[PDB]
Design a protein around this ligand. Structure first.
Ligand SMILES: COC(=O)N[C@H](C(=O)N[C@H](Cc1ccc(-c2ccccn2)cc1)C[C@H](O)[C@H](Cc1ccccc1)NC(=O)[C@@H](n1ccn(Cc2cccc(C(C)(C)O)n2)c1=O)C(C)(C)C)C(C)(C)C
Lengths: 99, 99
């Protein structure tokens, strides 16, 4: 698969055996997911962002499926307006900028 | 070039006869750059962000050479931690997300 950028790169994902939609965001260090609940334990933390900050719940070692490809990694859960897939998981699935 | 993502896709650009580093950000609709001066007229605008909106100046028909590639379009100036290069301009340099 190869994705142009004329629309928003909205890809579908599966976490917790649930179907979600997410943004393929290369300017995100971390993966930040909407309000949802997850197994395992977690540290609170502030994430940066354009103007101001938000509290993310940090879940390590989450199994996530981005678009057909399995990846394991840290996942941040908080008051975000969209599910954001950052570099940390984008690498895992061999995603790469190409012009 | 092919940019894998183990590190921030920070690249080099040229605007108003300046060289600046900027992030290649596929989860950004527009291009927003740090406080600088540019030709012509601007509208006020707000931008969403993760943790709230910031006031920006909107400029049109602005020329950016991104990574050796020439492009034109709407650029936003304001209080951002980094020059973000968005889709509005990435499409132009033929940029595509690959895996
Ligand atoms: C290191 O900091 C870091 O990794 N922070 C990240 C971050 O904020 N990344 C950069 C920014 C960044 C990067 C690096 C640093 C940095 C780097 C080094 C040192 C210090 N700072 C700081 C900020 C911006 C990011 O790509 C966001 C993601 C996003 C996308 C959509 C909605 C909310 C958030 N993009 C934007 O904020 C851009 N933006 C905002 C709204 N939109 C349109 C849109 C799309 C989809 C849905 C909607 C809704 C539902 C809201 O209607 N709107 C859009 O495109 C914008 C930038 C143009 C405003 C994450 C928090 C995402 C991880």
């Amino acid at each position: 698969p190869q994705i142009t950028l004329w629309q928003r790169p909205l890809v579908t994902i599966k976490i917790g055996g649930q179907l979600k939609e997410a943004l393929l965001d290369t300017g995100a260090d971390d993966t930040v997911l909407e309000e949802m609940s997850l197994p395992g334990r977690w540290k609170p933390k502030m994430i940066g962002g354009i103007g101001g900050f938000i509290k993310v719940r940090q879940y390590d070692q989450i199994l996530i499926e981005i678009c057909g490809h399995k990846a394991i990694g840290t996942v941040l859960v908080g008051p975000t307006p969209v599910n954001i897939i950052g570099r940390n998981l984008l690498t895992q699935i061999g995603c790469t900028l190409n012009f």
